[PDB]
Amino acid sequence: ANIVGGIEYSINNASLCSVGFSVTRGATKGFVTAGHCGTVNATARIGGAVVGTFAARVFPGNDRAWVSLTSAQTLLPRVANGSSFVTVRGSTEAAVGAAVCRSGRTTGYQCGTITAKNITANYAEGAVRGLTQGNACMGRGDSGGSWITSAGQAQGVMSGGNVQSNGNNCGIPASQRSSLFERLQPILSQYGLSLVTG
Secondary structure, eight states, X not given: OEEEXXXXXXXXXXXXXXXXXXXXXXXXXXXXXXXXXXXXXXXXEETTEEEEEEEEEEOSBSOEEEEEEOTTOEEEEEEEETTEEEEOOBOOOOOTTOEEEEOOTTTOSEEEEEEXXXXXXXXXXXXXXXXXXXXXXOBTTOTTOEEEOTTSBEEEEEEEEOOOTTSBSTXXXXXXXXXXXXXXXXXXXXXTOEEOOO
C-alpha cells in the first residue's frame, strides 16, 4: 500500500483511524498515528491488506503511537488533500495564530488556525495533557490523521475534538470548535523516528 498522511486504516478488523505521517526508524518503515487507535501489536490493515502492527503507544497521559510496517509498504512524503497532495517538508512547529490544516478519512482535508497550546483533554480513559488546539473541524475516524501547515510543515496527529451528535464539529462555527492534536516533535524523539520528507 502507498502510505500517505490522512488515509484510513483499520485496527484488528474493528476500529478505524487515519494515518499521521510516514517515518523511518533505521531500516524500519512506520507511520505515526494516535495512541488511542490501538494497543501494542494490534494489526493495522489498509484496504483489507495487513501492512504492519502497532510497535509502541502511550495513551492516556499522551496520545501517540507508531505502527511498524512490513518491507512491502511504500512510504511517501505526502498528506492527502482530496485528489491532490501536500508534501511534507519538515516539522517546524507553528505558533499560536498560525493557519493549519488536518487530513483524515472522515471529514477529509479541513483548515483553521491554531488557537491555543498545552491543553488538557479529559477523556473517558483519563486526562491527556499538553495538546495543541486548532479550530479546523473534524469527525470520529479522523483520529491519528495529519495536522500540517499549507507550507508543508508537519504539526502533529489528530487526538480528539468537541464532536456533536452528527459525529463531527463541522456543523458549529470555527469559534466554537476545539479540535485537539498531539505535537509531532516529542513522538519523533521518544521513538527515535525520522520523518519522510520531499
